[PDB]
Amino acid sequence: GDDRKLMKTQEELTEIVRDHFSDMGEIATLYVQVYESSLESLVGGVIFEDGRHYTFVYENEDLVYEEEVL
After folding, report:
1. What is the domain partition of the chain in residue ranges?
2. What phi, psi does 60 have (nearest 5°)?
3. What angle do CA 4, 36, 12 make, to 5 degrees?
4. Are 48 and 26 in contact, with CB atoms under 8 Å apart?
5. Architecture of domain 1-70
6. What one-character-per-residue DSSP string does 3-34 give?
7. Rounded Cα–Cα distance for residues 45 and 67 (Å)
8. Are 41 and 13 within 8 A, CB to CB?
9. How far is CA 14 from CA 1, 54, 56, 67, 69, in A?
10. Distance CA 57, CA 52 (A)
11. What is the Cα–Cα distance from 46 to 69, expressed in whole angstroms?
12. Which of 2, 19, 36, 50 is the most buried (most CB within 10 A)?
């Protein structure tokens, strides 16, 4: 009888993404635009001081990213 499944938090999903990019440069602004309190996913891009906006999607084990270009 199975009601003890503990998942991530808005802390943890962000702390993964933050701890990652802290090892690859310096962030002007970090935030989340979309948080899954029901799954373990994280999107909100990331903005560097140096003017490098990237999108970022942590999906399970795929940590995909790309430049923001519209």
Report:
1. 1-70
2. 65, -70
3. 75
4. yes
5. Roll (3.10)
6. -------HHHHHHHHHHHHTTT--EEE---SE
7. 9
8. yes
9. 31, 15, 11, 19, 23
10. 16
11. 13
12. 36
CA distance 60 to 4: 20
Residue 24: both structure tokens together: 């690859």
Instruction: Write out the two tokens for 66.
Output: 């790309």
Say which experimental method was used.
NMR
Give the Cα separation of 48 and 32 in Å (integer).
15
Which residues fall within 8 angstroms of residue 41, CB to CB, at 6 or more apart? 13, 34, 57, 58, 59, 60
Token representation of residue 61: 């084990």
